Design brief:
Chains B, D, E: One of its GO terms (cellular component) is cytoplasm. Six copies of one chain form a homohexamer. The first copy, chain A, is an alpha/beta fold. Helix content of chain A is about 40%, strand content about 20%. Chain A contains ten helices and twelve strands. In chain A, the strands form three sheets. In chain A, strands 6-11-10-9-8-7 form a six-stranded parallel sheet. The first copy, chain A, has a four-stranded antiparallel sheet with strand order 3-5-1-12, covered by helices on one side. A two-stranded antiparallel sheet of chain A has the order 2-4. In chain A, strand 8, helix 8 and strand 9 form a beta-alpha-beta unit. In chain A, helix 1 packs across helix 3, helix 3 packs antiparallel against helix 4 and helix 4 packs across helix 5. The longest helix of chain A is centred in the middle third of the chain and has 32 residues. Chains in contact: A-B, A-C, A-E, A-F, B-C, B-D, B-E, C-D, C-F, D-E, D-F, E-F. At the A-B interface, helix 1, helix 2, helix 4, strand 7 and helix 6 of A face helix 1, helix 2, helix 4, strand 7 and helix 6 of B.
């Protein structure tokens, strides 16, 4: 597994800090003194999966010289309970307090996603079927969100419109055929791109499998349909189910001979995971 | 209320577009076509519309793109699934390449407005306002605050530079409520609102006496809040916060507080489903 | 007091350096050798108040590895005489000479402001009345300029149109009333924003004080008027005097029961404070 | 002369606008209004107009905004208090939110042009040009140089890459005037002007002999300059600099120097008062 | 094919313009002129036109500038010296200040398209495609890929995020061809093409067996390639690469490979001469 | 001589790295392990002149903590043969492999230019005549390209339209005279700018030399013409020959009393110089 790198994230965290301070942090600067070391504790207030700890840390490190301490040796991925002491943060009060909210907003958002993902995986209860994310991401945080999904046991779809070809309802509409669209796609980007078709009917699934595409997406199809689609396609393409996949629904795929399912809810509708920073103490 | 301006949003939408297309949109560019086209924007789910200008603007930065609004939909309107919110007219390459970004904005924003409007309704008391927080999605605060407004909510301080909020940690570090307020007033004398976050009736007393502008009752029982109201006796504005959800929120109904605030509105909003379907060529 | 942070200033100094070098510094690079340590001295050529020393230093530090020496222990705020040895700068010749002008232009501009501010404070001669800056700032240096004002013994008005509400002549014009404008302002940003009204007549001052606004600004009012305005308002709002406040005028407020006065001249019309960098020596 | 172009100024005006509005303009947005409006730009003080295009452009980046110039004012014109320089037409939100930034540019630039024109007048000699310096406001050099031109001044080297200026420190480090010039010519052979800053008649002699393009007489007495002129005998162009102010400047009047230069024009310019008043609605 | 969009290119052209003008264009601004003007864009050399939109766009970001295309030239057309490709209409300051940047784009891009088209011709086999690489000019990859398309070429993976290419070093570090492929598939399961770079027939065998999408034959003899084709037996797509030049390229003519690739097309392209002459004033 | 500075180049290399990685380097990250030190060797596969070694190095250093080793002590400027071991690069595998192509693309491009330049200088075989570059540069790499030219023994023309005045065919067209254009140029930028005129005929050369311009450029003139132009001008201006100067042509200037020649081909049409990175080994 791969953590996130400062090279990847620095510009985004900078922007977020600027979002949160346009002149200065009056509330904190009024009370504190420029000098003097302090310690604050990061506590998990809710159960789930840890994600974004590096990102959390990095918020502080761009701002100021700040040290950490990890007594329980927590890592992105670890399961969490409320009251767990995830991390200790050491530095000047001004740094600890000004940076707090941004850091937490990243941590809370990411951990939320990883937790929702891990819970989907569990509710599915079938290793042979993978859980994938989408491009239904929060604007300008896709990178961070894809990472969280991985941390929760999920997997990454195409990142971008540049990564791979996905012929959607609208693409097929504009050509007028499933097969003409695939042909055109193959003509345009001959060998280096995966080609996927999004499909609503069994008609369209047949056309696609026949034209020899790499991946077929079954959009919002009934279980009866999917069962038939599987047999139709008969291993000619990989199979993805998508649309309207949630914690309750997801178990319906258990045991099917599809390759993966994908969910937008993991990225566009994730509940965040509560943490807090309490127990400010001076070193002394 | 007041819409979002290109000046405010353009850099963010540009960035989101670049996020989504590093080289080119292979899928779409592959379509060898005859011409103007039209696609329809449909609401797939009930709630409140927010971010329609933003949605539109994604297309308008990319290319020359026209709209049509047959049902005269505006940010704020209630929506039902299948409503024809908008029609988008332009080249296929523009319509398709811009689609996902535009929708991701629209879905996220409408989601927030919907959740907000629902909190307002569950509260059922116009004399008490619903406020957002700083518990926002990183780099989208501006947008999120706007959505809250659209849903009938109100805006807290935008950030740490807007206004002074003396939290648990601040009061800890000084050792007094009143010394902290004095120090805050000394630092930013007349142009900044000062708010104090408070857990006990002790602390609420100190603060109201020291003449602060806003007192925040953190996670207090209803018995307590009732007494706090009386103690404070109109000396400061009153905010209740902490652990405010769709079910809880009605507990405030009778009260002579000024507002309540919720993070859940910004950090945990379910997005609102829309789609773009029905691609047709014009001729 | 709070100094300025690299986080706050780095992007601006970078931009200024780029302004001053688009390819390279031909004049300096032609003569120097890439290698070899040197020392230059920063001298105050004019009396006043020091401001922007950190900023001065930081110009060099972004560019190159550069050390300083402060034999007289000078700090932003200290009073200065011509010939004072403010600082010694140690590093490669190329760094010392290429960075010089930018660094000085910051220092000179900031110290100029702090000096003009301190002189206003002195000419006023009344601690009970504070001296405030405005939004009449040099474009893209507001942050730096507000800081200098603080250093000279002044105080900071609202930074931005986002910081606080100020209902000006034009706002009141567009509504048609003083009180309707205040009402509208309170309706729009209910509790978290200070509300100020800018006022020319005693009529308007009465309306505002009655509607219970936080701050009233007396724009360019005669001393007779201000005296009456004070009594009218009768402590209902804070009182700010503004417009046409200069070194000579400013003493006219001495002893009045107003809260502060504010001046644009401090930021839009500050004379800069002369320094120079002389006595280049090689370490050897 | 030649105006400033959007290409040149847009990024700076965008930044200044962002400086002034981080979230939104609460004050102005609070106005719930009927419609196009009109505001008038009045000169509050006498001097020279500079930066009118810049002023205008602040509004035009923000929003669709029209102007009207009934007295046909142009950068360069002389101004009196109460002159109606311009009329601005657009939505209230645009007129009010953009106002201060626009004025801060206009005031600063006009201030510089005015001070410049006044130096030119106090000099009273067309054969001697007034030049600006690198002692500029950080990140506004471009703008400041333009204002100087508008006021009848002329532009020195824009920066350390434009042209070679061998200062006291440079000559110190080589140990000779002539060796420094030789080294400069060796480094940038044909495409760069070479100037030498000079304190004695000794050094002026060396430089003129070595055939440099421009000699700068730093802070020299009038007796000296008179002799320097003779010594140099047209071999190089001649610049006087150091300690040149509105009172001093007339001392150069008769002289056969090419130009004088002043920092005060850019680092110490008093700004020129304008205001925007008389908001009216159109109908 | 599909043109380049302002969305794609604007930031790069802005930067190039800023590269070329830090303060102002002294040369051009010095011209004190009467008015619209017209300049003609002439091809000085034979080859393939590419980047005409880009050329145009340089002017259109700067200023209001119109074009005229009397011979209806389009990216892709063959060119001869003296052809009147385009006419440019606008203010002199715009025409002259923008000229060099615009031409530098046009010349570079057309150069690449020309070299590409020439490789395609020397190959003389439609069943085998000519591909570009990642051996591109820094920060112009997008543009360079486009030019290749215009010249009749095709696009490899745009970068290290587009698709998986297991090179000599990768296979070295795992120690197996097949283990490396397995690991790649495990890491990015369904959405990424996997290619293997291969030097021996051993390695080609392993790869084809493990079912990879594309095999690259690095710098292999014609005898070898012939056998490799047979060995692989349609299981993977086949790419030949390494040491492919205008003279060599014809050696592939009969073969049942899918494509060949060349770096020289992007890292070593001779540019294609154009000029802008015949400045006239309109009246 | 002056190397290139991080201050100068960092933004460009960052942009190039981002160009080459929008999400992550899947190929490398799949195989490697985050941990573990390795060494790769940089070999010259082709003879010529080294340029851009610092730039090469810097690509890696922005990305990650990476060390170098230079056993043969190679410097920008050194002559090279195929198989020479230019440099050794030491760091994590992920860094070595992800950064490789960008680094090489800079090195190859720059060394290519320096080699083509040095070869022009040699083919000219006349020290009294200098070889100059132009503004016919690769967009957004001018700075890097000018440097390479210097490294190959060449010299730098004006960087920018801001550096110096060059009155071209189109400028002279728009005024209608050679001399009116020069006069206008002198009026606009009086003393601080060199003035050059680009000239096709002997007529125009005479006008210019008479009006006392600093530099005259003979555009694409026959050797007979140039010979006459030299005598005409009679030392009144410096002389530049330009247009259609290539490796074969260039010797035609040998012994002429011109000051320099200039070539666009050096920057717009340089063949790149082959290097490669081979011999990946783990430290162990």
């Amino acid at each position: 597994s791969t953590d996130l790198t400062p090279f990847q994230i620095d510009d985004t965290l900078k922007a977020a800090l600027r979002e949160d301070v346009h002149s200065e942090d009056y509330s904190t600067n009024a009370i504190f003194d420029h000098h003097g070391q302090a310690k604050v504790s990061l506590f998990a207030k809710e159960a789930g999966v840890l994600a974004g700890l590096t990102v959390f840390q990095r918020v502080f490190t761009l701002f100021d010289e700040v040290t950490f301490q990890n007594p329980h040796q927590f890592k992105d991925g670890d399961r969490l309970t409320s009251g767990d002491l995830v991390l200790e943060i050491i530095g000047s009060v001004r740094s600890l307090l000004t940076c707090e909210r941004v850091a937490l907003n990243f941590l809370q958002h990411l951990s939320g996603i990883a937790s929702m993902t891990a819970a989907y995986v569990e509710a599915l209860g079938d290793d042979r079927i993978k859980v994938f994310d989408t491009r239904k991401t929060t604007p300008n945080l896709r990178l961070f969100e894809k990472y969280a999904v991985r941390v929760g046991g999920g997997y990454n779809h195409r990142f971008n419109l540049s990564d791979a070809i996905m012929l959607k309802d609208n693409h097929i509409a504009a050509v007028g055929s499933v097969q003409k669209a695939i042909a055109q796609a193959r003509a345009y980007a001959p060998f280096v791109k995966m080609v996927e078709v999004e499909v609503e009917s069994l008609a369209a699934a047949e056309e696609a499998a026949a034209a020899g595409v790499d991946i077929i997406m079954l959009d919002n199809m009934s279980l009866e349909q999917i069962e038939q689609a599987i047999t139709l396609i008969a291993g000619r393409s990989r199979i993805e189910c998508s649309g309207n996949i949630d914690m309750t629904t997801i178990s319906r795929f258990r045991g099917l001979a599809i390759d993966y399912v994908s969910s937008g809810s993991l990225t566009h509708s994730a509940k965040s995971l509560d943490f807090s920073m309490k127990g400010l103490t001076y070193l002394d």
